[PDB]
Amino acid sequence: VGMSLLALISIFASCYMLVAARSKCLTPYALTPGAAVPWTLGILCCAPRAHA
Amino acid sequence: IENDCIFEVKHEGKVTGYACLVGDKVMKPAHVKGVIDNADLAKLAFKKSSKYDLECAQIPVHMRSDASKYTHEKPEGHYNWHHGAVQYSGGRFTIPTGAGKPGDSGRPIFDNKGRVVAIVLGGANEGSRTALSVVTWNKDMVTRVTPEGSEEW
Amino acid sequence: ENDCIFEVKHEGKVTGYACLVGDKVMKPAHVKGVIDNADLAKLAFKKSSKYDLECAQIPVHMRSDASKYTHEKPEGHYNWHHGAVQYSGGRFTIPTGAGKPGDSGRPIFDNKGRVVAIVLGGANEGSRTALSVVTWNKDMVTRVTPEGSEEW
Amino acid sequence: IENDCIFEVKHEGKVTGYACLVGDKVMKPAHVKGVIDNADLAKLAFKKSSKYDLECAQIPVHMRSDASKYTHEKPEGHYNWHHGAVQYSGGRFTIPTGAGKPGDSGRPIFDNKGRVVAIVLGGANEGSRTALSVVTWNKDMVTRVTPEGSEEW
């Protein structure tokens, strides 16, 4: 139980860090009028599908 | 200039700022408090950013026409404001001191051709001109320019 | 420029048009029908679902009646068969109503007289309906669709 | 000045009365139900008093200026009122009967110089002149003077 709990906390913390990184890199591009979102970051991170 | 594009934010009956409707983005200075005066715009999934201090969302398609045009090319020179004019020089925006006071922190900054170049955030008083802590659009980035010793509007 | 836009027929009535640009016959793919010109109707046309543009190569004889094209799209005012269109901020805007569903092929010209767009649809909004259009960037053809645009 | 000093109090869209901004306290008839219109004075603490029917509080310091002056002297005579005027005789305030109708009891009463003497609460008609059931301030005491049979406006 303890090992599995630690594994879950590790997985969840890592995944949260990943999604936080997703935010910290993509939110600078969602608050701009022009949704460029260059396909490099568009592929590397799942792109919000900006709607021209 | 364009009345129907700058919307005020209310906080217990007090206009604490404005939210602009520019470039397919409804936007407001995140650090100003309150809720949009428009009821139709109020029920939107806004999205914050502490490091940029600009809370924005998508303009619903029912009001898309009342949106300003936007630019990133910001030549050095003179630009417009809802309190008089602003002078852009050296990566800084300068205004006659005092003109514009805390509590109107959201109003935009237009260009000679009439299209939005910046969103005011704050003031920094030094001398006969106050430097306007402003949030701008680079080609793809959004950039904060806060002069040293600025103060939040 | 009357002999450069060919209408597409469905059971006796024009349901859209097929434009003749740049050594390519092209049409809004989603509209059904047959090219009115029989000589051009018997050509093979390569469709593309994700771009809604069905095109083919114009026969060598009639290349002359084809318009000139451009890719450089400055901010400003462009032409249309229904009055004018405005290009601003990466969108095309028309007066609402100017666009009727069913004239969904016709092109958008530029000031100098060369095709810059091919309308497909409209996203109705306020006084200025946005035009969902398939443009040609310098080497790609790209769809610009505002939300809720309805296929004309 | 005195034409934008008395802030109306709303209740589902009907003008149910006025709350006056008197001296240093923003008083209000402690009968009239509703919510004050300018929202800010509706968030201040509100000490009520049934026995006096005059519910007041301490004015937010921002709007200190826009508040009328007070007096205790009420020599026999003629006094002002937004529906005309009242006449102080025999310990009673007299108005043309009919002048003023139920629903607007909050309004002040000024003096010739202009110092808010009193705040009306209701009417009582007998003869051509209706007596006003009205609150005053003595040198140290708020006081109700209500003639018999008065029905609240």
Author numbering:
A (entry chain J): 371 to 422
B (entry chain L), D (entry chain P): 115 to 267
C (entry chain D): 116 to 267
From the primary publication:
Alphavirus spike proteins comprise trimers of heterodimers of glycoproteins E2 and E1 that mediate binding to cellular receptors and fusion of virus and host cell membranes during entry. We recently identified very-low density lipoprotein receptor (VLDLR) and apolipoprotein E receptor 2 (ApoER2) as cellular receptors for EEEV and a distantly related alphavirus, Semliki Forest virus (SFV). Here, we use single-particle cryo-electron microscopy (cryo-EM) to determine structures of the EEEV and SFV spike glycoproteins bound to the VLDLR ligand-binding domain and found that EEEV and SFV interact with the same cellular receptor through divergent binding modes.
